[PDB]
Amino acid sequence: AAPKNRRTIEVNRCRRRNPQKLIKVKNNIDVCPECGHLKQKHVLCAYCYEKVCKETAEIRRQIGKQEGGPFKAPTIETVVLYTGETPSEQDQGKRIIERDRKRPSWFT
Amino acid sequence: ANFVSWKSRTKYTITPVKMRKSGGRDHTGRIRVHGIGGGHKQRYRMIDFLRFRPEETKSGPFEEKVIQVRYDPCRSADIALVAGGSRKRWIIATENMQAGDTILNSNHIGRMAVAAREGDAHPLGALPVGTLINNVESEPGRGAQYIRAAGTCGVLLRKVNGTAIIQLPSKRQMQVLETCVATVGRVSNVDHNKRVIGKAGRNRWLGKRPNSGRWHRRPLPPMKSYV
Amino acid sequence: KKRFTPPIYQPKFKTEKEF
RNA sequence: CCUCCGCAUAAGCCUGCGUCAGAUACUGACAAUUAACAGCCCAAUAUCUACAAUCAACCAACAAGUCAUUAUUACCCUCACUGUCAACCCAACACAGGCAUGCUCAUAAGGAAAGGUUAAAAAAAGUAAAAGGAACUCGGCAAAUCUUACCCCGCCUGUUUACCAAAAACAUCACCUCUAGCAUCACCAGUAUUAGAGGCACCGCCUCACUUGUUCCUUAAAUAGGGACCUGUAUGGCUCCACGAGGGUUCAGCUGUCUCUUACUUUUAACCAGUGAAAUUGACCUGCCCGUGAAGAGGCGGGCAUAACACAGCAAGACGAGAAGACCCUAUGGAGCUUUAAUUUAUUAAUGCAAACACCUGCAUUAAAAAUUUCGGUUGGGGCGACCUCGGAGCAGAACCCAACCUCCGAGCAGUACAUGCUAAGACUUCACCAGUCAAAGCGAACCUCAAUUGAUCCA
RNA sequence: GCUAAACCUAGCCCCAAACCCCACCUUACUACCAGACAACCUUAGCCAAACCAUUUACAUAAAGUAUAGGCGAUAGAAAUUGAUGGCGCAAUAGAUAUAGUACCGCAAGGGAAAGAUGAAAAACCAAGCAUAAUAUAGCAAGGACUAACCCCUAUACCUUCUGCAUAAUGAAUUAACUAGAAAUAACUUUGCAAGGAGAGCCAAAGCUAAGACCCCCGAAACCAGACGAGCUACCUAAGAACAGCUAAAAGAGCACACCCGUCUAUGUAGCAAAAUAGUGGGAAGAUUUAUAGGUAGAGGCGACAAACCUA
Ligand SMILES: Nc1nc2c(ncn2[C@@H]2O[C@H](COP(=O)(O)OP(=O)(O)OP(=O)(O)O)[C@@H](O)[C@H]2O)c(=O)[nH]1
Ligand SMILES: [Mg+2]
Ligand SMILES: [Mg+2]
Ligand SMILES: [Mg+2]
Ligand SMILES: [Mg+2]
Ligand SMILES: [Mg+2]
Ligand SMILES: [Mg+2]
Ligand SMILES: [Mg+2]
Ligand SMILES: [Mg+2]
Ligand SMILES: [Mg+2]
Ligand SMILES: [Mg+2]
Ligand SMILES: [Mg+2]
Ligand SMILES: [Mg+2]
Ligand SMILES: [Mg+2]
Ligand SMILES: [Mg+2]
Ligand SMILES: [Mg+2]
Ligand SMILES: [Mg+2]
Ligand SMILES: [Mg+2]
Ligand SMILES: [Mg+2]
Ligand SMILES: [Mg+2]
Ligand SMILES: [Mg+2]
Ligand SMILES: [Mg+2]
Ligand SMILES: [Mg+2]
Ligand SMILES: [Mg+2]
Ligand SMILES: [Mg+2]
Ligand SMILES: [Mg+2]
Ligand SMILES: [Mg+2]
Ligand SMILES: [Mg+2]
Ligand SMILES: [Mg+2]
Ligand SMILES: [Mg+2]
Ligand SMILES: [Mg+2]
Ligand SMILES: [Mg+2]
Ligand SMILES: [Mg+2]
Ligand SMILES: [Mg+2]
Ligand SMILES: [Mg+2]
Ligand SMILES: [Mg+2]
Ligand SMILES: [Mg+2]
Ligand SMILES: [Mg+2]
Ligand SMILES: [Mg+2]
Ligand SMILES: [Mg+2]
Ligand SMILES: [Mg+2]
Ligand SMILES: [Zn+2]
Fold it and tell me: Are residues B128 and B168 in the same domain?
């Protein structure tokens, strides 16, 4: 099947500017109370999630260095301790991941 | 084309010579004969058809010893390696020719008729009338050209004048100067005519290509004389 | 008979032009 | 999770995912592949070189087979050159195709079917299915199973229209017909048990087969299949052993073929993001019914209907897209093929006569081989049949003229005379021209019938 | 306001005048060994004759005359006479040309496109859209109207045809390019005039000169000369491959690689200008295949399918 006639620009505009095809305005956007960058109510803040992701990547690099090779997952819990922090009595008996930076305020 | 005949060797030898098939193609590269092509590779064995070829420095009638009788891929009749003096040569074997036999080749036309013995070569004038001959020459010294296929035998009918009448296997009659040499007996492999191919593959082995698929819709001649 | 028209290839430069 | 592969050599290509720097597997610069592997050879003159390979030993052969030197003379005093990369070649492409060889026979090597989501229809692939088991259908196609007994054709293995036909066609061993008495480029380094050109198709038996009707088996039912008998036609006819992706028939089984469809998975699909064609397209503000009409309307007439828009399906219409219809007819348009179509023998082969003392040349004749060209028209489409020119009568009643593959008659002469001589006003005219008609007067003489009863130019 | 638009000179056309280190024929562009092998030979056909067969063109004047000629289409003499640039193009034009390059094809061979500033760079307008989607109804317009629509009237165009809105052809649209050449005799206008004309020719008012006067694209074809057997048909040389099982020296059976392509489904601008999946035939032979060579179109080759010879 092939077009019997060329579709006019008027018809084409009627089709491609219909409200369905138009991009809908999103009303679920809000300001993240922590950093102030925009976020969607149901989605995590991109900026804060990036912070957490980069800190997690650093901690995981430290974990990999401590483990030293594949198939070396510890059988004991892990605790991340930053500069100026000493293992607590509760943290005793857990492998310590030492980060060469001060404790982040958001991380507790 | 660049076709050059493989028949370039100039010195007679016993060694099988490496042939080159033509496939029925002329030197121009075009097909001149149909139905020829392929087949088993063969080596040519130079056949000395001049049975009376006295060895260098030698002359007169001479005898030779049959070393072996061998199948020849290029001939219906099997050949024989016959050796005399200090030379060997391939010849056309006769029916009852065995290894170790003695074969006499002579040029003497005696007043009487030589006692014909199968396998020996004598001038046609010396043969008894009615003997079975083969490898007959058209002219004295030309070399055998007739009655050379398996089981073929000519008949010596008459010896009028200094000429001999030969009935060829096709029953045509031929006048040849009596001095021309012929060998007694019939050619070997007499049962060649009763050979059953059995399969088209055997013809292809022998080198005969299949016929074209396209569909298509007497007194004995006079005697041929060479005198 | 069998009627076949071979495809016609357009010159390559037309589609190989660059800025 | 896959492993078709993969690694090398050959062939091919020619720097085509190495480093750096830039942009917006690209651009510029830089670097690289190192000979032992491979290529690139040989001083002459003669002269040697019968005895395969197959574990080569037995055996077994037929298709009869790649592998060898000596004699004399010259001659050592010298390790260059070239390929070496890659994700690669031929297919317009990072193309599901093609691509020789050695090893690996599933890999130690090489790879990723899913961009994300949902789980609509339709579509593709797959799995499963109650009871039934071909009732589907042209046909058991496909699928599932492993499954008998036949018939036709072809003997068989093979070959074929690359890209719609794989066959009953072509070939084929075997048999048969014809031609040929011979050597230095095929046939053939051969010689009648040979070679070539053919026909048909193994072998075996003969020199009965097919058609007209009646009937039997097979099914519940048969224009299907098989088997009989009965009437006439017509040394190449019968005979199926084996074989066949050949064409029909069939038992049993099998099964989604079907009664009668359903469920699920993958792809596809729909939505989101990136990239982004093709045919088509007069303009379209692009409704239904009836009627009309260039003989079938969205657009015309009379009615009815009617806010505007997307998205997904459907295929009734847009005489839908696609290919200036392959069918049919026409064209004083082609081409292929066949000929006892026309015209030729330039070319070969023979002869014969010349010329010369068999060959060559010239001229004729006969064949083979070919070559050039054509294959009328009317026509109730075309073909077949009939017809094609001329005159009389109706149609066409009365000046003239009127078609018909309309109705009827006829003609292609005959006869009589030899002024059936010559000239010349004026007229007619078959709707043109050509052609065909009549004719006063005059000279010269005596004192043409018939409707058609025919034909130009050129050329003889 | 984006795509874009324009531009002037790169050059070209017609005339005049004038005559114009090394390597490389072997596999070209390869330093360096016994050659011998060397070229002349009527064009044909299309086309016209409305077919086609003999035939058909390749200074002025005499003259389109003598002649030739299926005496027809047409062909056609000789004696004799005397013989300094552009009312061109200007980037779809003009050379094909920025180049015989890129690209395409094995080869012969085919064959393009295009650029635009300024003295110095060491300084508004085609189509298509967007601004700005759309309102009942209809060849989209016209008559109008206060009012865009609503009202009434109106069956796109071209070609072809007896007759087309036709559901007959062409066209998506914009820009550019793209198609009537000429004699005889007439007619009009001049000059001169029984003469005209700048030799020839015409003339019983003619003659000289001028004005006016006849298209584009398209076949299947035919012939000549080249190029092609890296595909395919066959052949030549020397090579290679064919597991395993049954049988036994087999154009044997089953069945890998390999070759082929029976049937079905998908695909049909496809992965593919013939493929994919399954299924299937052969798979020690008349097998398959790599390499180099050969047969070339009045031809080759062909187990004839009028097969194949670079889709
Ligand atoms: N018609 C024409 N005249 C030309 C052509 N070339 C040159 N001329 C003329 O030749 C004459 C001389 O040309 P110039 O260039 O002035 O001089 P030149 O170099 O001595 O001339 P030539 O000798 O012709 O080379 C002038 O009248 C030019 O117009 C040409 O192609 N055609
Ligand atoms: Mg035949
Ligand atoms: Mg392709
Ligand atoms: Mg993937
Ligand atoms: Mg997806
Ligand atoms: Mg079931
Ligand atoms: Mg049924
Ligand atoms: Mg059944
Ligand atoms: Mg039914
Ligand atoms: Mg099946
Ligand atoms: Mg068969
Ligand atoms: Mg077969
Ligand atoms: Mg073949
Ligand atoms: Mg086919
Ligand atoms: Mg084939
Ligand atoms: Mg087929
Ligand atoms: Mg046959
Ligand atoms: Mg049935
Ligand atoms: Mg998208
Ligand atoms: Mg209607
Ligand atoms: Mg829709
Ligand atoms: Mg559909
Ligand atoms: Mg319409
Ligand atoms: Mg259509
Ligand atoms: Mg047409
Ligand atoms: Mg036809
Ligand atoms: Mg014609
Ligand atoms: Mg008249
Ligand atoms: Mg003509
Ligand atoms: Mg014409
Ligand atoms: Mg002259
Ligand atoms: Mg140009
Ligand atoms: Mg505009
Ligand atoms: Mg129309
Ligand atoms: Mg038409
Ligand atoms: Mg159209
Ligand atoms: Mg080849
Ligand atoms: Mg095997
Ligand atoms: Mg076999
Ligand atoms: Mg045929
Ligand atoms: Mg045919
Ligand atoms: Zn935040």
Answer: yes
